[PDB]
Amino acid sequence: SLSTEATAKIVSEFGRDANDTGSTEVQVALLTAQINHLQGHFAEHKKDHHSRRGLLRMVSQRRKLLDYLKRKDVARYTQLIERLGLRR
Amino acid sequence: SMQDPIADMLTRIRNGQAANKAAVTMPSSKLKVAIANVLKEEGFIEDFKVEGDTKPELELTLKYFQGKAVVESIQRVSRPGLRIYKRKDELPKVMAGLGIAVVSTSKGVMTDRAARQAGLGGEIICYVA
Amino acid sequence: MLKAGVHFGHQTRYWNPKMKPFIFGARNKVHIINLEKTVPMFNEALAELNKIASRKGKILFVGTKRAASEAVKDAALSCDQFFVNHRWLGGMLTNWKTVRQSIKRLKDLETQSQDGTFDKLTKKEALMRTRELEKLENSLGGIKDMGGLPDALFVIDADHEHIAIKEANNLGIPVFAIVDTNSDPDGVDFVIPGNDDAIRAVTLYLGAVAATVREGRS
RNA sequence: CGUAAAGCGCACGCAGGCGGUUUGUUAAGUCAGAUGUGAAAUCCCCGGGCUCAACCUGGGAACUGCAUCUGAUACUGGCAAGCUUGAGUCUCGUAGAGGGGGGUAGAAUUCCAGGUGUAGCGGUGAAAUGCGUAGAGAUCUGGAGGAAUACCGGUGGCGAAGGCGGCCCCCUGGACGAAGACUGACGCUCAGGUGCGAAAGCGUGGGGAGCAAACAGGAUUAGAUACCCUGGUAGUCCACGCCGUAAACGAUGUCGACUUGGAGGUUGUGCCCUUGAGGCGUGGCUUCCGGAGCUAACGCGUUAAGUCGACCGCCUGGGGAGUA
Ligand SMILES: [Mg+2]
Ligand SMILES: [Mg+2]
Ligand SMILES: [Mg+2]
Ligand SMILES: [Mg+2]
Ligand SMILES: [Mg+2]
Ligand SMILES: [Mg+2]
Ligand SMILES: [Mg+2]
Ligand SMILES: [Mg+2]
Ligand SMILES: [Mg+2]
Ligand SMILES: [Mg+2]
Ligand SMILES: [Mg+2]
Ligand SMILES: [Mg+2]
Ligand SMILES: [Mg+2]
Ligand SMILES: [Mg+2]
Ligand SMILES: [Mg+2]
Ligand SMILES: [Mg+2]
Ligand SMILES: [Mg+2]
Ligand SMILES: [Mg+2]
Ligand SMILES: [Mg+2]
């Protein structure tokens, strides 16, 4: 469900170091990463409603997180949505 | 949830008491203590204790008199849904005079008797008897 | 401090939760009571027992089970005390005034066993009325003479004596009982922990009660 | 608001409501005093005047309110910075009919072909319709086709509910456990909103073995538009799209905290000569039973219908009507 390789990658791409796993950005980032991956899973299939529920789950979570950030460090927010490439 | 912790205290007493339980503990708070204080000073709990530091630990000793417990009834009054604030002439006296009413004021968590003398009022946390 | 050669504790799962404060057991899936708590309860047991026994002891050694019964028809029976060693005719304390006549029958019969009418009637009626006697005999011995109201009650196994204790509880009769780990206490004013159905804990405390009622004021 | 009226079939989630814990600050809520104002009459209290009273009248009291000033800082709200227990993130693993897609297997039924065999078969309560000398049924052999997956199998397991059982691969959701590390209240609930949502039913193509609404035939019966029998269309199957309801039930909304026990089932994991197929613990989930307590009773009972809090849905006699 995302590669230990790939999840690690992103931790080392958005946090202080690896280990800084729970850093806001890092969550928001490896959620994004899956959410996007998944969009092809549900591109085929589409009738996989059940799995879809986790995906919605994913979005609404990352959304809450994204919100909280903006509330704290509005800087780290903008930087993040630009660099994660969303919020249009 | 944890949203009202004072009712959680009130109830941990209420419960353990009806469970004939010697002690009873709970996460502490400034607030919590100042109340247990009053409970002790007025002789409803036996004696409290806050065995913590980072993760404080308010702990109380319940008393049992005859066979009963000393706390025949412990209800919340104010609460985060609906906050109660009585002036002073309006302060409520429990069981006529017996039993007490824990009230927070511009000068600390006191008893209705005390607050009445003090000449002030405030949020009437709970009732005890 | 102990004396109980071997009553240690007794009774395995069936423990009644309220019997916690008198248990420290654990051996082989059965708990041993608090050996050293049974004892300070002989302090108070035989004490307020003998305390009322001098002021005049009228006891009622209530105990049953075809395997311990007759071992109550002794210094328990004999001395300043009375006994019930069979099926406790419910309401015998609570209907004492109904049953009172179940006594008049017993006497008015044995008082006429080797007395009065007897070898007459039929050779039917004979042991075909001592079937009446042998019956009313057990269950309604320790009643016989009552003289001085039942005053405390010594009871063997608290819950197996459901009724008689409850009866007392109702009537103001202080109930001294020994209560296994499984039995329900609090029905007992003077609670005596430890085993209740081994031939010892009985005779021990049993005979040891006889041995303190029996003497208290010379 | 379990069974009397009443928990939306289920889920996510905006507004809103509610929000762990420390310190500082703020002083709106809250609290305090002062001051002004709150018309008179009325009401009430103590008097006074009519022969009493009704009535009239003096004076207080009351007008529980509002507003201004000044103060109090515990609680609530605002601001600031924290904190680690709530909540997330990361690592390894475990169980699973969780979802979606592609393969594939044997047992059977029906059908086609053939061998053998020959007068019945089938069916009911009894029968008859039906089927068989163009040879049925029975029996053996080969083949085609759809549908469902015996045994495992179990108060067994998964899912938010609906619901999900052969085997295999592929994609994928959730849960739990052992450790430790990171985030630092990031949370709970949610009107409106959106998604999902049995079976039936509808739209287009397809598919069709068995079952079977409708319909036909035979029976039963006073009647038989039924129950039984012989047939059998839709439908039941697939793809795409609809519909959005069920006693959608635990007839019990979600979240969190606290409160005696006993016997199982299931599923992780720590420790012990692993030296017993185990032994002692420690989580998740579940079944029966039972204590306080709760309840009209029945019953519920650490998976509460007990003790409490936050939020939401809903009830207010029966019928009329979930109708217009
Ligand atoms: Mg109803
Ligand atoms: Mg607080
Ligand atoms: Mg006026
Ligand atoms: Mg006058
Ligand atoms: Mg504050
Ligand atoms: Mg076949
Ligand atoms: Mg064949
Ligand atoms: Mg998985
Ligand atoms: Mg739908
Ligand atoms: Mg359908
Ligand atoms: Mg169709
Ligand atoms: Mg038919
Ligand atoms: Mg409905
Ligand atoms: Mg059900
Ligand atoms: Mg429901
Ligand atoms: Mg249990
Ligand atoms: Mg039960
Ligand atoms: Mg509840
Ligand atoms: Mg309608």
Note whether B64 and B127 are same-domain residues. Answer: no
CATH of the domain at B44: 3.30.1370.30
Tokens of C94: 């609570």
Phi-psi region of C66 (alpha: psi -120 to 50; beta: other; left: phi over 0): beta
CATH of the domain at B104: 3.30.1490.10
Q: Is the dihedral of CA C30, C31, C35, C38 positive or negative?
A: negative
Note whether B26 and B44 are same-domain residues. Answer: yes
CATH of the domain at A55: 1.10.287.10
Q: Is the dihedral of CA B17, B18, B22, B28 positive or negative?
A: negative
Q: Where are the alpha helices (DSSP H) in chain C?
A: 35-38, 42-54, 75-78, 100-110, 130-137, 162-171, 199-213
* Experimentally determined by: X-ray
Note whether B6 and B50 are same-domain residues. Answer: yes
Note whether B8 and B43 are same-domain residues. Answer: yes
CA–C1' nearest nucleotide, residue B88: D31
Note whether B77 and B65 are same-domain residues. Answer: no
Pairing of strands B122-128, B100-105: antiparallel
Note whether B61 and B113 are same-domain residues. Answer: no
Q: Chain D: nucleotides under 7 Å from a protein CB?
A: 11-14, 17-23, 29-33, 71-76, 83-92, 98-101, 159-162, 171-174, 181-188, 195-197, 240-241, 255-263, 292, 306-311
Q: Which chains touch B (3 or more CB pairs under 8 A)?
A: none
Nucleic acid strand D within 7 Å of B121 CB: yes
Note whether B49 and B83 are same-domain residues. Answer: no
Measured at the CA of C118, the angle between CA C115 and CA C119, to 5 degrees, comes to 120
Q: Which of B30, B48, B71 is the C-terminal boundary of a domain? A: B71
Note whether B28 and B82 are same-domain residues. Answer: no
**Distance of C155 CA from D80 C1′ (whole Å):** 72
Count: domains in chain A: 1
Count: domains in chain B: 2
Nucleic acid strand D within 7 Å of B108 CB: yes
Q: Which of B53, B71, B89 is the C-terminal boundary of a domain? A: B71
Note whether B115 and B78 are same-domain residues. Answer: yes
Please name the residues in contact with B102: beta carbons below 8 A apart, sequence gap of 6 or more. B35, B38, B39, B109, B110, B111, B124, B125, B126, B127, B128
How far is A56 from A40, CA to CA, in rounded Å? 15
User: Which ligand minimizes its atom distance to the CA of B30?
Assistant: 2
Q: If you search the block for the tokens 């709990």, which residue do you land on?
A: B45
How far is B16 from C76, CA to CA, in rounded Å? 43
Note whether B64 and B119 are same-domain residues. Answer: no
Nucleic acid strand D within 7 Å of B11 CB: yes
Residue B40: domain span: 1-71
How far is C62 from C68, CA to CA, in rounded Å? 11
Tokens of B128: 């005890």
Helix (H, G, I), strand (E, B) or coil at B66: coil
How far is A31 from A26, CA to CA, in rounded Å? 8
Q: What is the resolution of this structure in A?
A: 2.9
Please state the separation of Cα A67 from the chain's center in Å: 13
Residue A56: domain span: 1-88
Q: How far is CA C185 from CA A42, B62, C9, C48, C191, in A?
A: 66, 23, 15, 18, 7
Q: Which of B22, B38, B71 is the C-terminal boundary of a domain? A: B71
How far is B59 from C31, CA to CA, in rounded Å? 32
Note whether B5 and B59 are same-domain residues. Answer: yes
User: Strand D contacts (CB < 7 A) among B residues 56-85?
Assistant: 56, 75-76, 79-83, 85
